Scaffold this active site. Structure first.
Site, PDB file in Angstrom:
ATOM      1  N   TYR A  57       6.035   8.442 -17.491  1.00 11.10           N
ATOM      2  CA  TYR A  57       5.437   6.912 -18.637  1.00 11.10           C
ATOM      3  C   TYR A  57       5.979   6.670 -20.518  1.00 11.10           C
ATOM      4  O   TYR A  57       6.055   7.582 -21.117  1.00 11.10           O
ATOM      5  CB  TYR A  57       4.125   7.042 -18.616  1.00 11.10           C
ATOM      6  CG  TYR A  57       3.626   5.607 -18.488  1.00 11.10           C
ATOM      7  CD1 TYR A  57       3.986   4.824 -17.884  1.00 11.10           C
ATOM      8  CD2 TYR A  57       2.599   4.757 -19.860  1.00 11.10           C
ATOM      9  CE1 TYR A  57       2.534   3.498 -18.074  1.00 11.10           C
ATOM     10  CE2 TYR A  57       2.571   3.541 -20.186  1.00 11.10           C
ATOM     11  CZ  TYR A  57       1.995   3.609 -18.983  1.00 11.10           C
ATOM     12  OH  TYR A  57       1.340   1.803 -19.179  1.00 11.10           O
ATOM     13  N   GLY A 275       3.608  -3.848 -10.678  1.00  9.13           N
ATOM     14  CA  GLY A 275       3.098  -2.744 -10.697  1.00  9.13           C
ATOM     15  C   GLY A 275       3.648  -2.483  -9.320  1.00  9.13           C
ATOM     16  O   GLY A 275       4.776  -3.013  -8.326  1.00  9.13           O
TER      17      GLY A 275
END
Lengths: 364, 364
Positions: A57, A275
């Site tokens: 991330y 997303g």
């Protein structure tokens, strides 16, 4: 002194392999003027939390000896609901009993307590305050613990980019049964936006369709219908009858699904990708870009609000008001209460492993 | 009276099947005050002209009975160079002998002559005029006949969307050896923009790379290298050393190539898709949209310049000047002269069938 517990890792990897629980102390008798001590009420397991632990991330909490551990270690979790238990001599914005959420990412919400500055938190009304003030409802712990990302994401994608004409225009989104998808359907209903939700087919399709329509989706179609070229006329007729246009597509799937919802927009459409389904790129036919003035862009709530506290405040206030008014509802989380009989990190590991069952909220 | 020939079709379809030639009259003794008669010098076969005839291109000439046909018929061709033959009593902007191109698309340029109003045309300097104006070069028939689509497309994509800092910033494009790609490398050099051209590998690669760098490409890599993140090091360094950033990607390929050039942009990058290689959608990783604030949009010169005469005017003026000043060069066309021995539509059908050989220009 308070003895707290935090879920940490010294090395990135799958949560099931690298997480452990660390006990640490917070001195509530020695608070600096602007400091605040909070106790966690609940914090969810979100995909981004898992990606940070995995080390994949873009944003992650720094490693430190802060929790005292033997070996540098990083905390976990970005979202959560906390309650103020004590404040320093110069703190006026918060008092014991107040509900708060972190004001910034990488806070480390998978733990029992935290010490921070008053500006490291944003206040939410607690049930007692909402009730005393005459509101019909107060926030539930899950609503407060999950208010910072998903509801704001749905609200901002629907209102910050293109102006949909009430009663007339439409947005289309895939991932219709996702947390954001369900908030978007409700916000669409509340703001009078028409919408098409695309969802994967399932054994209880009719039940899911009825549920999404009740939340606010105008029409619900399966991915098979989304893929059908023969279905184009029906969608065009839905839009023609409303006198508006499909101006906005919300994508969280990519691949053929993203192609299908993009094709359903009218000319000058905008797609916001917020997303993506594991290794499924956003796929858009060349003709939409050239002939339909189509634009594909991204949405990342964290980046959008980083230097726009005002926009953030306004959005959060609206979601809070709708919860108090009983106009917005969350999807229920599967809650696991930490009572000390099982290590805290194990509750989160089970949460990660059981994410397919539903949103996992560890409570305290 | 003038007897003219026009390439027409009464129904959409493949050029080889639907085109025919219609003889028609233009009365040069009865011109309205603002009318002008022009005689074609040359007009090319472009993909858009073919797609228009096929019925899969949304901007097209109306079928009319204007050429004296039994059924409504549409003309063909959107760009071309003509010589003014005669003008009406109230025409002052044009005079006999002047060179002009159509002021709008859908005029029909695959024909020998046309009657229109003075504002249906835009004047280009003819060689005699460029010479008298002291310019070192005059435009060739191919340069004038192909000036309105490809050169304007390259110029506008590079200047109308994102501002690249001269001597520092970069654009990257695929289809590096295409007509637009070659104009873009030259215009990039003139604007002092750094650029990377991505091209397909080929037998005489060294020669091609050298030719493109001479045109203005700063660096040239193949699609294999574009796909090798292992080669990706070599690219990140180029940008670092320049002190600028890669802010714009020009895509006319789609698929894996579009993914590759998008990945090379810095944060906040913009991709413009202006073409695509048959049913190969624009494919962009979800992460670029979300974490790199990437945006992908389209470019269609026909729509951009519809209702924007000033932008079209100023862009055309700069391209004309660059040809006169010897700063821009066109790829050579394969020219086929119409002498009246073979039906005009057949020359164009051959041009469509032979477009893989190089740009086909039918001359008169």
């Amino acid at each position: 002194m308070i003895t707290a517990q935090a879920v940490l890792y010294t090395q990135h990897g799958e949560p099931k392999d690298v997480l452990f629980t660390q006990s640490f102390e917070i001195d509530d008798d020695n608070l600096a003027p602007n400091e605040v001590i909070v106790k966690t009420l609940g914090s969810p397991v979100n995909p981004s939390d898992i990606n940070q632990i995995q080390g994949v991330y873009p944003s992650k909490p720094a490693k430190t000896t802060g929790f005292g551990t033997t070996e540098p270690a990083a905390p976990c979790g970005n979202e959560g609901l906390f309650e103020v238990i004590k404040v320093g001599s110069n703190v006026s914005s918060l008092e014991a009993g107040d509900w708060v959420i972190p004001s910034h990412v990488n806070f480390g919400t998978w733990r029992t307590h935290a010490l921070g500055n008053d500006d490291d938190f944003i206040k939410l009304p607690n049930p007692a305050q909402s009730k005393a003030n005459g509101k019909p409802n107060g926030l539930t712990i899950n609503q407060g613990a999950t208010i910072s990302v998903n509801p704001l994401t749905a609200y901002l994608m629907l209102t910050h980019y293109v102006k949909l004409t009430p009663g007339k225009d439409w947005f289309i989104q895939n991932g219709g049964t996702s947390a954001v998808g369900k908030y978007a359907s409700q916000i669409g209903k509340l703001l009078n936006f028409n919408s098409i939700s695309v969802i994967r087919d399932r054994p209880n399709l009719d039940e899911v369709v009825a549920s999404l329509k009740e939340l606010g989706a105008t029409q619900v179609i399966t991915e098979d219908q989304n893929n059908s070229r023969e279905f184009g006329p029906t969608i065009k007729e839905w839009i023609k009858q409303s006198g508006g246009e499909a101006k906005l597509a919300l994508n969280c799937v990519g691949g053929k699904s993203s192609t299908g919802i993009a094709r359903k927009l009218n000319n000058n459409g905008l797609m916001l990708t917020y997303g993506g389904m594991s290794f499924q790129p956003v796929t858009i036919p060349t003709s939409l870009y050239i002939f339909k003035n189509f634009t594909s862009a991204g949405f990342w709530v964290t980046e959008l609000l980083k230097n726009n506290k005002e926009l953030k405040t306004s959005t959060l206030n609206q979601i809070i008001a709708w919860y108090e008014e009983g106009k917005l509802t969350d999807a229920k989380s599967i809650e696991t209460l930490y009572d000390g009989t099982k290590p805290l990190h194990e509750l989160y590991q089970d949460g990660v492993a059981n994410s397919k069952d539903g949103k996992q909220l560890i409570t305290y």
